[PDB]
Symmetry: C4
Subunit: 219 residues, 4 copies
């Protein structure tokens, strides 16, 4: 039966039938958003969904016989597996992000369709060249997040009260998001020199970030 | 008479006459801005305006006899047709954007003056090589926009209450506009973990955009 | 006496003496900032200031005899004349920005010291290659500034009430400065679709600007 | 005994033992952030800290015998000396930033591990080719900071009242942070033309910054 199904699975029809369902379930998921649409055709699309979920597990079963070990060493397939598994965790119990994480199956449109895979791959490939810098920065953040917690967290605990809070705030300063009127002018009403912490933080972090883009512009 | 007008239309004088009108009609449109000016020369200009609109339909009519089918296959010519067409819908009925969309005719200074054609074409030409990325992202936006509507739309309906609302908010976060103090800090007073949605969102989207600029800086 | 002074003017000591005065006068101007310093040594400083202003006119007089026409065809010389000229209009009358525009003489440090000249020249030289795009942009801004004034200036005159206000507001959206929570979200409370005006505006302008940087990242 | 210790110090075990304390002390410093953690194990980790602080002085003492003058001409070594010395200044007297500056020792993970060393060095190396620009800019900032103090500091002392405040505010406009709704729109309520100061300042400064990135994307 193997070559029979290996011929079904590898069929152009099959790959296109899946791509056809993704665009439908994506279109159908934009509709589940509408409280109006749901009052009318809610029962329709709850079923249609569970239907596609089966079809997708059947496929993942079919795809596994045909590829076996080869399949659990394919990034795009591994993905597809975990993304369908999520969609299988009952519409109940645990966390309800699991109900929400179901929308991640629409990323299969990236998986199932080449050129996308190409483009995603193109992107992902740039990351290893970035890991030295990314490491450097995270060390830097960690170091500064610590200083700030112990320098401003007493008076300013919303923003710096906890190590995690300082991380969030420092991230916000890095994106240069409302950094002065939002964080540093306030801080300075109590700690006049806080500028001595943040201006250097800004230079270094933006400098590094310029460098990193230039590196991605030469590899 | 065909060649008579093909020599009128194709004449340098004809083109320079048109360009001359555009600059005048453009100057006059900055004047229609002044409620003061309109109270004095308001009548002067409304007529000046209907005049140029005629002169331009005459030209488009002329330009078409000289080119026939070659014309409705020229971007720049097609443009001026539709742009002049907008300005033909009577000053009344329907929507009032049509009255406002008239000033689109000043883009004819781009259409009728070389160099601008060069630069605009330079620009437009870059877009095809971005279509793979642009799609990747729009798929991404669509996915996240759905996640956010169902994760935050009950408590935060201004920002995430509807799929389209979420598009806009997500757009704003992506342009890194007031994202933390404006949207996520508020969100977190109710959903402590919202940062788990927006920081990853910020990374991907900022990553992708650097790559896109670096790609353009290759092609 | 000509070659005598041409040997005075062209002397290393002369130039270095001038550069000496620039850095001294520049330091003195930072001190003129202090309301304290001025109560103490304000008199000390205003005389030294007028002294420097004399010396500089003397120099500029001398420099011209030694170059004649050659001088008023030197950008950097023209600058120095026009900068020293500003500092010559008496401490009284007309516009008082003239008292303030005096501090522009510290740009003589760019003018009198090479390498700076190099760097400045390096920068300025990039400009000609940008003028087609800068023209493109100004036309774009002019067209949208007009549309916005007539679409929004009635309900929102602070931001769009006048052609000039719209220019300013459009510039601000372009710097992506507080654009959503500051301008468009407000606008939309009255004009739900204003997003159809600003998102396209934002795309084009940010596109064009990226193109301009890559263009510069090639020449 | 020299070659004995020169074989202790230069050993793989030595180097990797130091790296072990850094990642341990660094972990231990994130924990001293928690006032919870400190209420239970505060005793443990103050001593652990003093332990590592001894070990680091012992090590720095050892490393100096092995290198003598060669060491005080190594940037990376000099660093570790200063950073350990900071951590020696008693947990008392003077200022409290010295207690806080202790966390700078976690930068030894950069110093004591290559690739980091490489990356940091790669970055720093880019700096000297920026110094003409960095200098140019600081002249410009100083000039405009002076102008602003005398144009806006009377009515607007929080933002432009003092030379240093003008520097800070100018920095913020340069990072394009809340500049319009935060500073210039306000300013314009009193000085209508303030846009004539900040728009040019924005152009020059944003221009220069683009040039500097393109420079770094050449060298």
């Amino acid at each position: 039966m193997y070559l029979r199904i290996t011929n079904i699975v590898e069929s152009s029809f099959f790959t296109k039938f899946i791509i056809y369902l993704i665009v439908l379930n994506g279109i159908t998921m934009g509709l589940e958003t509408s409280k109006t649409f749901m009052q009318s055709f809610g029962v329709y699309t709850t079923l249609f969904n569970q239907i596609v979920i089966t079809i997708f597990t059947i496929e993942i079963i079919l795809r596994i016989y045909v590829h076996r070990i080869s399949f659990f060493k394919d990034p795009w397939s591994l993905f597809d597996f975990f993304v369908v598994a999520i969609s299988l965790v009952p519409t109940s119990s645990g966390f309800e992000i699991l109900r929400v994480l179901r929308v991640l199956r629409l990323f299969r449109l990236v998986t199932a369709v080449p050129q996308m895979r190409k483009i995603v791959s193109a992107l992902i490939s740039v990351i290893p060249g970035m890991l030295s810098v990314i490491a450097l920065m995270t060390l830097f953040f960690y170091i500064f997040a610590i200083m700030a917690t112990q320098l401003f967290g007493e008076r300013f605990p919303e923003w710096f009260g906890t190590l995690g809070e300082s991380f969030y705030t420092l991230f916000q300063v890095m994106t240069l998001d409302d950094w002065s009127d939002g964080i540093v002018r306030p801080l300075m009403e109590v700690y006049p020199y806080a500028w001595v912490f943040f201006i250097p933080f800004i230079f270094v972090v933006t400098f590094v970030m310029i460098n990193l883009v230039v590196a991605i512009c030469v590899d």
